[PDB]
Amino acid sequence: EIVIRTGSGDVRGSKENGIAVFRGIPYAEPPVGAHRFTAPRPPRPWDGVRDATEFSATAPRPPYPEAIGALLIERFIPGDDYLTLNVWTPDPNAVGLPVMVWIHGGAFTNGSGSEPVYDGAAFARDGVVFVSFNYRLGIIGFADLPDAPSNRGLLDQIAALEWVRDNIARFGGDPGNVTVFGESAGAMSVCTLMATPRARGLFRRAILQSGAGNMAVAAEDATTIAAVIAHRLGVEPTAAALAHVPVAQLLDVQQQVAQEIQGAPDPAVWGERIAGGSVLLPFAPVIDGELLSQRPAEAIAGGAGHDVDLLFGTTTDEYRLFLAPTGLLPFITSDYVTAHLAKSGLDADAAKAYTAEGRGEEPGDILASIITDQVFRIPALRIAESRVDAPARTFGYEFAWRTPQLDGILGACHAVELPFVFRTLDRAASLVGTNPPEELAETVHNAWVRFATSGDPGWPAWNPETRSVMRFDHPVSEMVTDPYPATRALWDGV
Ligand SMILES: O=C(O)c1ccc(C(=O)NCCO)cc1
């Protein structure tokens, strides 16, 4: 047992195998009932010692779709008191350790800070204090309502980072050397936080794994989403009304909304905009004129975050996670790809560029590469291009290792780098297989520690001339210049 006094009361953690670990430290009061929709409230001070040996409840979430869910096996924990954070440090009484703060992904609807694959022990054993946490998700986190502040989930993330600022020195960390990092929705959250004055000084460096500054819900779309949710619940689209809905009913309707938007929305239900594809993620942060007055990429184009060191990257075959496991790909037709390209204003022959660069010969494979570029690769490069004159540094990676799961159909799909970053390969066998290469997890994890420690991951910085990134792969990880250049240029005016 090991007892540490936070700014609001003592907590009891555990010191085993050379590392002190604290689980379930509250940073915000339970968001119950009407407080599903209020700003996060600092926990009520306490006397005595709060037990911090066990992960807390996690935020309410519906199951992943079955195929995805078979690859990403989530660990649910029941309860109401879920706005908590977790700390791993090698020595609470050390001074000046780098701090990493993880923001989990999961399309703003799923995930938790305490998933087994996000274990922080490997970072602590390398001399870094590691923090993870839960934030509000789905309707509760992000649905926009006239009588509630927008983007509670983002308010939660700011509150957790403010706890780290005001408490991490008591766990051995330097609050002036905080690296925030996330994957997918967590990385889009990092770009959103870089973009708002409300979070300046809460971190010195950022790592963006498969997420950029393109994910925001237009206020008029968020209103439509709320109206459909309330109609199916038989209530008014207000916090006053949704405060009383049993959570299982909230989740069931939330699930149907997400399925409908990820497919081909029915204009009769969703209006012309959403049926036309204006919404990529229906519970992404809304443009509120408070935290978001524009898409984060445009704030960053305006100089937001230019003082924060940046490490960014994507996987080679990102979108294959969402298209391949459900057998969708063999049925895709050339005319469908052409029509897809035509919504972005590109001619039919743009698909040949993908074939010429080895990014697909069949329409379905070409489609997956196109959407990989539109949602992940190009948005990441736009942030990097925006930082040409930034005083801080910018480094890039491509995670190219391909998983063998599902008979090789995924490639280097979305989320595949996570257990390599955390050296938790043995907890992600459903995604990476039973014998992934530990040497690569060593390489990737060590570069993350180097970047947290010094602001340099150990390879040349990214610039718009050579567009150099570190290509992570198993036998050999090595630098490459401007990968996939022809397919990149297709999007220049787009
Ligand atoms: O564009 C999408 O459809 C999408 C983007 C990001 C996520 C995510 O943050 N989690 C990874 C697996 O859910 C999910 C879906």
Element (H, E) at 225: helix 219-233
Which own/partner pairs from 54-58 qualify as long-range (CB within 8 Å, at least 24 positions apart)? 54/23, 54/24, 55/23, 55/24, 55/84, 55/86, 55/114, 56/23, 56/24, 56/26, 56/81, 56/82, 56/84, 56/114, 56/134, 57/81, 57/82, 57/84, 58/82, 58/112, 58/114, 58/134
Ligand 1 centroid, distance to 430 Cα (angstroms):
17
Q: CB under 6 Å to ligand 1: residues?
A: 105-107, 184-185, 280-281, 322, 375, 414-415
Residue 322 tokens, joined: 């969402």
Does 2-217+285-301 match 309-489 in CATH topology? Answer: yes
Who's near 314: CB < 8 A, 6+ residues apart?
210, 372, 376, 377, 380, 398, 399
Displacement of CA 23 from its chain's centroid (Å): 21
Q: Which atom of ligand 1 is nearest to the CA of 105?
A: 9
Continuous H helices in 324-428:
334-343, 350-356, 363-372, 378-386, 418-422
Burial class (CB in 10 A: 0-12, 13-18, 19+), 76: exposed
- Is 189 noted as a catalytic residue in this protein? no
Nearest to 373 by CA among 395, 398, 336: 398
Q: Could you tell me the distance, in angstroms and rounded to a whole number, from the CA of residue 258 to the centre of ligand 1?
A: 11
Distance CA 404, CA 97 (A): 37
Q: What is the 3-state secondary structure (H, E, C) of 229-265?
A: HHHHHCCCCCHHHHCCCCHHHHHHHHHHHHHHHHCCC
Phi-psi category of residue 338: left, alpha or beta, with phi > 0 → left and psi -120 to 50 → alpha: alpha
Whether residue 468 lies in the annotated active site: no
Distance CA 257, CA 273 (A): 15
* Active-site residue, from 115, 183, 318, 398: 318
Q: Residue 35 is which amino acid? A: H
Question: Which mutation among 66, 72, 184 tests ligand 1's pocket best, with the greatest number of atoms within 8 A of CB?
Answer: 184
Q: Rounded CA gap, 434 and 46, in Å?
A: 45
Mutate to test the pocket of ligand 1, among 71, 281, 378 (most ligand atoms within 8 A of CB): 281
Cα–ligand 1 centroid distance for 96 (angstroms): 35
Q: Which amino acid belongs to residue 440?
A: L
Longest dimension (CA), the chain: 69
Residue nearest to atom 12 of ligand 1 (CA): 106
Task: Tell me the β-bridge partners of 11.
Answer: 4, 50
> Closest ligand 1 atom to the C-alpha of 72?
12
**What is the C-alpha to C-alpha distance for residues 171 and 489, in angstroms, rounded to an integer?**
47
Tokens of 302: 């305006």
Q: Beta partners for 328?
A: none
What residues does each domain of the chain span?
A: 2-217+285-301, 309-489
The dihedrals phi and psi of 345, each to the nearest 5 degrees, come to 85, 20
Resolution in A: 1.9
CA dihedral 444, 449, 450, 452 (to 10 degrees): 130
How far does the centroid of ligand 1 lie from the alpha carbon of residue 397, in Å? 19
- Distance from Cα 183 to the centre of ligand 1, integer Å: 9
Cα first-last separation, the chain: 57
Measured in Å, residue 319 CA sits from the centre of ligand 1 at: 9
For residue 185, the CA-to-ligand 1 centroid distance in Å is 7
- Residue 24: burial class (beta carbons within 10 Å; 0-12, 13-18, 19+): buried
Indicate the helix (H) or strand (E) that contains 130. Answer: strand 129-133
Token look-up 């996060």 returns: 40
Which residue has a Cα nearest atom 11 of ligand 1? 106
Name the catalytic one among 398, 414, 468, 477.
414
Cα(411)–Cα(34) distance, integer angstroms = 44
Shortest-distance Cα residue to atom 13 of ligand 1: 106
Ligand 1 center from residue 184 Cα (angstroms): 6
Q: Which of 262, 291, 287 is nearest to 277 (CA)?
A: 262
Residue 84 host element (H or E): strand 84-89
* Closest C-alpha residue for ligand 1 atom 14: 107
Amino acid at 403: T
Q: Rounded to whole angstroms, what are the CA distances from 437 to 339, 417, 432, 443?
A: 40, 12, 10, 10
Phi, psi for 438 (deg, rounded to 5): -60, -35
Report the structure determination method: X-ray
Q: For 17, which DSSP code? A: T
Ligand 1 mutation pick, 109, 414, 430, max ligand atoms within 8 A of CB: 414
370 and 362 Cβ atoms separated by less than 8 Å:
no
* CB neighbour list of residue 27: distance below 8 Å, 6 or more residues apart: 40, 42, 43, 83, 84, 85, 133, 159, 160, 163
**Both tokens of residue 426?**
């043995």
Residue type, 345: G
Q: Among 184, 189, 369, 477, which one carries the catalytic annotation?
A: 184
Q: Output b/e per residue, 465-478; b: 16+ Cβ within 10 A.
A: eebbbbbbbbeebe
Bridge partners (DSSP) listed for residue 116:
none
The alpha carbons of the chain give a radius of gyration, in whole angstroms, of 22
Q: Which amino acid, residue 165?
A: R
Class of domain 309-489 as given by CATH: alpha beta
CA distances 404 to 51, 411, 436, 472, 484, Å, are: 41, 7, 9, 16, 23
**What number does the ligand 1 atom closest to the CA of 262 have?**
3
- What number does the ligand 1 atom closest to the CA of 106 have? 10
Ligand 1 midpoint to CA 158 (Å): 21
What DSSP designation does 375 have? I
- Ligand 1: which atom is nearest the Cα of residue 185? 9
* Burial environment of residue 44 by CB neighbours within 10 A (0 to 12, 13 to 18, 19 or more): exposed
What's CA 448's distance to the chain center, in Å? 16
Nearest partner of 298 among 221, 376, 212, judged by Cα: 212
Number of the ligand 1 atom closest to the C-alpha atom of 321 = 12
How many CB atoms neighbour CB 494 within 10 A? 9
Which of 322, 374, 410, 431 is the pocket-test mutation for ligand 1 (most atoms within 8 Å of CB)?
A: 322
Burial 369-400, CB ≥16 within 10 A → b, else e: bbbbbbbbbbbbbbbbebbeebeebbbbbbbb
Domain 2-217+285-301 CATH superfamily: Alpha/Beta hydrolase fold, catalytic domain (3.40.50.1820)
340 is catalytic: no
Query: Is residue 399 a contact partner of residue 417, using CB atoms and an 8 Å limit?
Result: yes
